[PDB]
């Protein structure tokens, strides 16, 4: 599995200046959590896919 995301430099400056969010950890936090969510859902999905 794989994902990716890109952000402009000006947006990173703009987001930090007006909101205090670094615009880089958020995308890292979003992508890392999303992959774990899909995998966690998948394993449960296979269990029901295989249950007698």
């Amino acid at each position: 599995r794989q994902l990716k995301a890109a952000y402009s430099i000006e947006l990173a400056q703009d987001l930090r200046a007006v909101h205090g969010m670094d615009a880089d950890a958020e995308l890292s936090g979003i992508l890392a959590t999303e992959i774990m969510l899909e995998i966690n859902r998948e394993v449960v999905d296979w269990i029901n896919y295989s249950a007698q």
Binding site: A6, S8, E10
Partner: protein, 52 residues
């Protein structure tokens, strides 16, 4: 041209790029035909013989 400049018809001007273009420069987000502006340098020599 200088005579026009004195008369006030034409005046010097200096602006800056709107941030929208400053992100979409030669690439990012699918934009095309917008290369950067670059600078370089050249080195040239001179040679001096000796008289007597």
């Amino acid at each position: 041209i200088k005579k026009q400049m004195e008369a006030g018809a034409l005046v010097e001007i200096a602006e800056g790029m709107a941030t929208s273009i400053a992100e979409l420069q030669e690439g990012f987000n699918g934009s095309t035909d917008n290369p950067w502006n670059e600078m370089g340098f050249r080195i040239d020599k001179q040679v001096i013989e000796a008289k007597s």
